[PDB]
């Protein structure tokens, strides 16, 4: 699924990532950049201004969860339908989320990573992540029925 070199770029970069802040930012931005998504998070307290969103305690906590999920995907690239099968059923049967929306969180996650690593975030490294974020979206949509 990923070349020996693509896995180099990916994990080499991910070891550097501070799983705390990056989560509450990917997630924080999903909310401002595409605000219609706020509906799925109505029980998160105040989400009424970017200011309050970025700084919302329960947004950051979800961030980490989202991101460790992502972390576990990397320990498992060779079989990602495997690693996200319980999460697919979750997002479908419990949350009723259009799988199209997965594109969006992968995208914001890619932007944060770029915000954080500038010159280090080169066309080649980015092309590695997209392949992952495309796969994490496909794996999440797999157990929809």
């Amino acid at each position: 699924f990923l070349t020996a070199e693509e896995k180099g770029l990916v994990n080499g970069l991910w070891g550097k990532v501070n799983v705390d802040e990056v989560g509450g930012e990917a997630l924080g931005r999903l909310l401002v950049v595409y605000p219609w998504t706020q509906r799925f998070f109505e029980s998160f307290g105040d989400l009424s201004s970017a200011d309050a969103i970025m700084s919302n305690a329960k947004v950051k906590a979800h961030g980490k969860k989202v991101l460790n999920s992502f972390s576990d995907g990397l320990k498992n690239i060779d079989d990602l339908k495997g690693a996200f099968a319980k999460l697919s059923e979750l997002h479908c049967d419990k949350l009723h989320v259009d799988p199209e929306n997965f594109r969006l969180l992968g995208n914001v996650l890619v932007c944060v990573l770029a915000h954080h690593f500038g010159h280090d975030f080169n066309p080649q490294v980015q092309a590695a992540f997209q392949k992952v974020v495309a796969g994490v979206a496909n794996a999440l949509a797999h157990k929809y029925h």
């Binding site: 970017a50 932007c111 915000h115 500038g118 010159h119 975030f121 980015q126």
Partner: protein, 138 residues
Amino acid sequence: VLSAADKSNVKACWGKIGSHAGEYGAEALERTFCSFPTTKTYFPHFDLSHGSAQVKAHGQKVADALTQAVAHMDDLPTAMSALSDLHAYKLRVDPVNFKFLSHCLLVTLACHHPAEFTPAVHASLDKFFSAVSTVLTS
């Protein structure tokens, strides 16, 4: 689509980009061909090697056009009319590819300007790239 709050944002930010527009224009393109290889099918007669000069030449034309749209946010469909003809009638580019560029343009403005690329500005830049892609594909 595009409040007045949105247009300040885009303008202010384009100010900072200034003389780097065309340089970003190219980098975003090399990133697009690079993450979304399919986009390459529309440039079979190009030299697409990393750092190809022909891309930098193309990169510039995209940026000016973008600068162009920033100065006609209030009526894009008119300003860009000649460009939607090219992209809809002559080349006929699938609307999916616009998402890929607009994405990589954003990633491009993020590697270079982390300070200015705040979520509110991120949100604004998106509706802007998106608003443009809409004119060029209709």
